[PDB]
Amino acid sequence: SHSLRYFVTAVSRPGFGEPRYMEVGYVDNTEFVRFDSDAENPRYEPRARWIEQEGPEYWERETRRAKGNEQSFRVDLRTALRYYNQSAGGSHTLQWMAGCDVESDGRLLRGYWQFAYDGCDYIALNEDLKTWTAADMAAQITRRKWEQAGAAERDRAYLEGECVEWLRRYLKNGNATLLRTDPPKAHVTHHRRPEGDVTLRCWALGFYPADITLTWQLNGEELTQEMELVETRPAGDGTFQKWASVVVPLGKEQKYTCHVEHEGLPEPLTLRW
Amino acid sequence: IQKTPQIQVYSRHPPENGKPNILNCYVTQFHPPHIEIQMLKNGKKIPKVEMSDMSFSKDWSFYILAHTEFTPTETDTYACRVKHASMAEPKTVYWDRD
């Protein structure tokens, strides 16, 4: 499956200037378009390689839509400041998630269209793409008025139509960098410790996508000891890294096997010290 | 109504002394999105802190990546200082070739 996702942040900056408006676009997990309101001549810039082949009309209409949504978020921020009976001198944030997760064939499996205020869930469009879930007492006024206007219908029309076909076009145009599978270079590092035991470190570097499984095994068993592994991080070039540690006795480091399984690998890699 | 940030300082390519490398600070899961990230060499602030898109995850917490060019030596210590709102005192995390 693949997803087209758009993340929007509107942050009021009282005493500083106009609120910052940001719009980032992701295919699966790779960013490809970006818009920032406080930069000079705010326009839609490319962030990938395969999206640069869009005509000036593409960027023109996307910038028009971005600025319209920016004004919409301005008035939304003011209306929320009135809704919650808050101070005009504070800085508050609206966050908007919108997109479509679609199976690898051509059927929309999930349409996302949700808003959060100051980090807490404000409103959401349920998977049915018809009913709104409103968490706050003030969010229910939004739900009622949006049922009156019928925003769910046009939002579903977007999600079920424009989102999926533009995801198809992006996948066909970016099949070079969006469908690639780079296997990870893996190795094990052995550091003695001032205690008396040894820290083994399994590394998986330079892979795509971020979906990877990294585990240690004792004697082919699921292992029964304090295993410390960190979260998948980007490298700053399109790939990711990961590592998993284990504290082992002096002399039994040859009993431990690190297993790394990636979607770009023919067989799960097993490494010993 | 605030979330404390999480910091990971690391090198892009396997680090070795004298070889040029990119050191980056990956700061995730914080709120509000107004933070400052400084890269420190031997205590001094590097000015080449080019940072990436201040995006956010499904949990609505923001993340960011700030990288800089450097050359790892056995005498230079490198770190990342983050100043948010949720931490009473700024968090400094030193780079370490794990």
Epitope: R13, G15, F16, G17 | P32, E36, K83, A85, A88, E89
Partner: antibody
Framework: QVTLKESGPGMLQPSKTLSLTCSFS??????????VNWIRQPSGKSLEWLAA???????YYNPSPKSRLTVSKDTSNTQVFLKITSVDTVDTATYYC???????????????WGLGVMVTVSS | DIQMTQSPSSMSASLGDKVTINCLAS??????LSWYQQRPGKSPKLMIY???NLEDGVPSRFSGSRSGSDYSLTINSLGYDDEGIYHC?????????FGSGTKLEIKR
């Protein structure tokens, strides 16, 4: 409410040490993005920014007064102190403390100002 | 320091007249400038932040503009309530430089 008040001794002799305090009741330099900055104005002249202190504890100074300034906060986020060593007759002025908000890396205008404390230096 | 020069040094207008106060920065202070008003015998209160944003509570007759590197603050329906001293701000480089200050009185 905000309301911040300057407190400090007027009429100081030269070459002594001036100690001002700013007390605010509306915000806290705790887990808050607010910063407090000291400003001074000699009567009949232009405003001069002296120092500033973030809620972290990080301090910023104006390099123009060589190295005689030191600004510091309380262990209880409710006051901010400024100390000027080797005070001169040229430092006679009215001193204010103002609030600003930290937006990433930059400060952003002074929302509320104190009332001002008049200090005069003469032998 | 990014010393900022404010001009004119002193202005005098009739009741209801529109007046403009200018401020220049030696370096590029893009939208990092605010205008403060100080009444006679009072502390400077903040008036305009950003460059064209009036702080909540400021009468709408005030306006803030920018033309290249010179910032202007205009006021059209002047009344006796606005005589005082006005100041520019800089909050960009850390040595925050102020304007020289402009005095606004009413003619007679």
């Amino acid at each position: 409410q905000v309301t911040l008040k300057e407190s400090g001794p007027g009429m100081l002799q030269p070459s002594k040490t001036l100690s001002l305090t700013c007390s605010f009741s509306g915000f806290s330099l705790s887990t808050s993005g607010l910063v407090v900055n000291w400003i001074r104005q000699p009567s009949g002249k232009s405003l001069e920014w002296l120092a500033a202190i973030d809620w972290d504890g990080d301090e910023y100074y104006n390099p123009s007064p060589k190295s005689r300034l030191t600004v510091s906060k309380d262990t209880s986020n409710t006051q901010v102190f400024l100390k000027i060593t080797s005070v001169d007759t040229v430092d006679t002025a009215t001193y204010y403390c103002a609030r600003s908000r930290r937006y990433g890396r930059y400060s952003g205008a002074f929302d509320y100002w104190g009332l001002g404390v008049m200090v005069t230096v003469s032998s | 320091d990014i010393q900022m020069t404010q001009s004119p040094s002193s202005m005098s207008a009739s009741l209801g007249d529109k007046v403009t106060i200018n401020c220049l920065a030696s370096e590029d202070i893009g939208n990092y400038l605010s205008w403060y008003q100080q009444r006679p015998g009072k502390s400077p209160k903040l008036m305009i932040y950003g460059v064209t944003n009036l702080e909540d509570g400021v009468p709408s007759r005030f306006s803030g503009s920018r033309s290249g590197s010179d910032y202007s603050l205009t006021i059209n329906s002047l009344g006796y309530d606005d005589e005082g001293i006005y100041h520019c701000h800089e909050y960009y480089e850390y040595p925050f430089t102020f304007g020289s200050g402009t005095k606004l009185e009413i003619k007679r």
